[PDB]
């Protein structure tokens, strides 16, 4: 599966969302 | 010397750290010089 | 030598008493005074350096004062092997060298 | 924390001659320890001679035996030899070795050698 990374600007703010597609996180807030 | 054979003086602390072949980035400036420097396999950011 | 101390002194066991030095402002006033003790066909052996200081190996029960051209050894807690001579011993900037007093034959009694 | 070693040994020579007094040291080395000696008399006191000099860098020499007494240092193999020379009837007597700090500021001998008698 793909692993894309959700950010708002890093100026804004260091926090992430990693999204992992095509794989339930059963798997591997 | 007779301290009322004989070594150690000062006090020594340092640090050692191992290198790893990994992926970096490396801002350089108007000068030349490397300023930021963010990892590959760090985390997702 | 020039140094001032009687040949002889006697005293009880395990009491207190001191040992004295009798100098000059050229040899005591100026420069530091160290003690020795030797027994009968042995080796001179430091007891004090400077009378303040005490090398390894010697008890704490020695002590040492300077007063002017006066230099005194405190010797505290004598015990029976304790009878030896104690040298009395300084720098000399007159003769520039190292000078020793007569010796101090203690007797403990 | 050091072991010094014989000066000499057992010496005797006829009048007329001249002997050397090869101070050993071990633990330590020669070039960090200040040399000294010890004229000492069978039934007589003390009678500093040789040392080497805190200030000055320099290897000293008793002012009364001056000329007559003369020193040189080996430090690899760390033998300090003092010679004698114009032998006379009172020399003979225990020479010991003995040694300050080698900084500066050291009037002690702590550690020494047990001496060496001669013969005149």
């Known amino acids: 599966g793909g692993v894309s990374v959700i950010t708002p600007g890093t100026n804004t703010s260091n926090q992430v969302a990693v999204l992992y597609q095509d794989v339930n996180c059963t798997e591997v807030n | 010397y007779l301290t009322p054979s004989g070594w150690t003086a000062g006090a020594a602390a340092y640090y050692v750290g191992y290198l790893q072949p990994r992926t970096f980035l490396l801002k350089y400036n108007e000068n030349g010089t490397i300023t930021d420097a963010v990892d590959c396999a760090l985390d997702p950011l | 030598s020039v140094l001032t101390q009687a040949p002889s002194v006697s005293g009880a066991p395990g009491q207190k008493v001191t040992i004295s030095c009798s100098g000059s402002?050229?040899?005591?006033?100026?420069?530091?005074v160290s003690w020795y003790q030797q027994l009968p066909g042995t080796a001179p052996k430091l007891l004090i350096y400077?009378?303040?200081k005490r090398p390894s190996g010697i008890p704490d029960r020695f002590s040492g004062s300077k007063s002017g051209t006066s230099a005194t050894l405190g010797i505290t807690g004598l015990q029976t092997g304790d009878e030896a001579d104690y040298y009395c011993?300084?720098?000399?900037?007159?003769?520039?060298?190292?000078?020793f007093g007569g010796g101090t034959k203690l007797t403990v009694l | 924390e050091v072991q010094l070693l014989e000066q000499s040994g057992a010496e005797v020579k006829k009048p007329g001659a001249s002997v050397r007094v090869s101070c050993k040291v071990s633990?330590?080395?020669?070039?960090?320890?200040?040399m000294h000696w010890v004229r000492q008399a069978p039934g007589k006191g003390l009678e500093w001679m040789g040392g080497?000099?805190?200030?000055?860098?320099?290897?000293m020499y008793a002012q009364k035996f001056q000329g007559r007494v003369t020193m040189t240092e080996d430090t690899s193999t760390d033998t300090a030899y003092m010679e004698l020379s114009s032998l006379r009837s009172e020399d003979t007597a225990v020479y010991y070795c003995?040694?300050?700090?080698?900084?500066?500021?050291?009037?002690?001998?702590?550690?020494w050698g047990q001496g060496t008698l001669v013969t005149v």
């Open positions: 003995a040694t300050t700090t080698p900084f500066s500021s050291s009037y002690w001998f702590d550690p």
């Open positions: 633990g330590y080395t020669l070039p960090e320890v200040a």
């Open positions: 080497f000099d805190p200030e000055d860098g320099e290897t």
């Open positions: 402002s050229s040899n005591i006033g100026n420069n530091y």
């Open positions: 400077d009378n303040n």
């Open positions: 011993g300084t720098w000399d900037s007159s003769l520039s060298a190292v000078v």
